[PDB]
Design a protein around this ligand. Structure first.
Ligand SMILES: [Zn+2]
Lengths: 187, 39, 171
C-alpha cells in the first residue's frame, strides 16, 4: 500500500464528505481489513448511522465488503461483514467524479450561449431569443407576450450569466491538489 | 411481493430505478428476440 | 433492604459531600455515621471495602481511605479539550453532551470557549455528541457546488457504465 494511495483517499474524503465518512476511513487505513462490528464499537456510531455511511461508501465503491460465515462456539450461525479498501476501484471513481465536473464545466460554457433572455413579467415565463421574434407584434413595433399582451424585457437575464464564469477559475484552482495526487498514484 | 421485486443469488430489495439502467443498456436487436418492437 | 438498600446511600451521600468542596477522603466507618447505616451488616462492611469502594470508577483510594474522583471527571476547560483529543487519537469515539454537563459544572462556558474545536452531532433525541475537531486537513465548498455534487447521481450507475465514461472522454 503506497503512501500516495493513502494520502489521496484521505484528501478526497474530507473535501466532499462529512466527518463520519472520514473517521471510518482512518480505521481501514491503520488496518487492511476491519470487521463492521468492530468499527461500530470504536466509533460508537448508531447501527443505522454506520450502515448509512458504509452504504454511501459502498455506493461510491471506495471500499468493498466480503461476507464470511462460520459456526460460533455456542453453535449459532455468525454472519460477519468484513470491509476493506479497493484502491484500484477507488481511483477510477475519483477520476469519474472529477471528469464529469470538468465536462460539466465544459457544458456550462455552451449553456451560457443558449440561455433564454426574453421574459414576460406578467406570466414570469422566459423565452429564447429565436422565440422572441415569433411573438414580435408588428403593430406595436416591440416584443410582447401573447398570453399577457404585455411588453417583454431582457435585462433581468444578464446578471446571472456572469456568476457562472467566476466558478470556472476557482474550480480549477481548488482542484489542483487532487490532480497532483492522481499523477503520483499512476504507478 | 406486492409492488416490490426481490433479487436473490444474498437477498437485496430491487427498486424500479435499479432496473431502468439495465433496460436502457438493452440493444434494439435484443428486443426483437424478446418479441418487443423497439420503436 | 439488606445488602442493597444500604450501599446506595453511601454512594449518594458521598456524591453530595464532594459538591461541598471537601476533597478530603473519608473512612468506611465515618461515612456510615452520616448515612444512618451504623447497623449495617458485618459482611457488608468487608464487601464494600473489598469490592464496592475499589471497582467503582468514582471512588479513589488514598492513604488507605476513600475519596471522590474529580480528576477523571472533566472539571476544567483544558481537561475537556484534552479528553476529546485522546478519543480522536486513540479512536475511542465521541461523548454525549449530557455526560460532560454532569461532570463539568457550567459546561457551557468551556464548550463555547473552545468554539469550533468541538464537533456537535445532534441525535434524533436532541442528544449532542462531541468529537474532536481535527484541524489537520480541512476543505469546504459553497452550497451551490455541494448541491450540484448531489445532483450528480452516482448510485444509479453500474460499474461497467461508470468505467466506460473514462475511455469515452479519453482519460
Ligand atoms: Zn406573459
Amino acid at each position: 500500500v503506497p503512501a500516495a494511495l493513502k494520502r489521496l483517499a484521505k484528501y478526497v474524503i474530507r473535501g466532499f464528505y462529512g466527518i463520519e465518512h472520514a473517521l471510518a476511513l482512518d480505521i481501514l487505513i491503520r488496518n487492511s481489513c476491519v470487521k463492521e462490528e468492530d468499527m461500530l464499537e470504536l466509533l460508537k456510531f448508531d447501527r443505522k448511522q454506520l450502515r448509512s455511511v458504509l452504504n454511501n461508501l459502498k455506493g461510491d465503491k471506495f471500499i468493498k465488503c466480503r461476507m464470511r460465515v462460520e459456526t460460533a462456539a455456542d453453535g449459532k450461525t455468525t454472519r460477519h461483514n468484513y470491509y476493506f479498501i479497493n484502491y484500484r476501484t477507488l481511483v477510477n471513481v475519483v477520476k469519474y467524479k472529477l471528469d464529469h465536473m470538468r465536462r460539466r464545466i465544459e457544458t456550462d460554457e455552451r449553456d451560457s450561449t443558449n440561455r433564454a433572455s426574453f421574459k414576460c413579467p406578467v406570466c414570469s415565463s422566459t423565452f429564447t431569443d429565436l422565440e422572441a421574434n415569433q411573438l414580435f407584434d408588428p403593430m406595436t413595433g416591440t416584443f410582447r407576450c401573447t398570453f399577457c399582451h404585455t411588453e417583454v424585457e431582457e435585462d433581468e437575464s444578464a446578471m446571472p450569466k456572469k456568476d457562472a464564469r467566476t466558478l470556472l477559475a476557482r474550480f480549477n484552482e481548488q482542484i489542483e491538489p487532487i490532480y497532483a495526487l492522481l499523477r503520483e498514484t499512476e504507478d | 411481493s406486492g409492488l416490490e421485486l426481490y433479487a436473490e443469488w444474498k437477498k437485496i430489495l430491487l427498486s424500479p430505478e435499479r432496473v431502468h439502467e439495465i433496460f436502457k443498456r438493452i440493444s434494439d436487436e435484443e428486443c426483437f428476440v424478446l418479441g418487443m418492437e423497439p420503436r | 433492604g439488606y445488602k442493597f438498600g444500604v450501599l446506595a446511600k453511601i454512594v449518594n451521600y458521598m456524591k453530595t459531600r464532594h459538591q461541598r468542596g471537601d476533597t478530603h477522603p473519608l473512612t468506611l466507618d465515618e461515612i456510615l455515621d452520616e448515612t444512618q447505616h451504623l447497623d449495617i451488616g458485618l459482611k457488608q462492611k468487608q464487601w464494600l471495602m473489598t469490592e464496592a469502594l475499589v471497582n467503582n470508577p468514582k471512588i479513589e483510594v488514598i492513604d488507605g481511605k476513600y475519596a471522590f474522583k474529580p480528576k477523571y471527571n472533566v472539571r476544567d476547560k483544558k481537561a475537556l479539550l484534552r479528553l476529546l483529543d485522546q478519543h480522536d487519537q486513540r479512536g475511542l469515539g465521541g461523548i454525549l453532551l449530557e455526560d460532560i454537563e454532569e461532570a463539568l459544572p457550567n459546561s457551557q462556558k468551556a464548550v463555547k470557549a473552545l468554539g469550533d474545536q468541538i464537533l456537535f452531532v445532534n441525535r434524533p433525541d436532541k442528544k449532542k455528541i462531541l468529537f474532536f475537531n481535527d484541524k489537520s486537513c480541512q476543505f469546504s465548498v459553497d452550497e451551490e457546488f455541494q448541491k450540484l455534487w448531489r445532483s450528480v447521481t452516482v448510485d444509479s450507475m453500474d460499474e461497467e457504465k461508470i468505467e466506460e465514461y473514462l475511455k469515452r472522454q479519453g482519460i
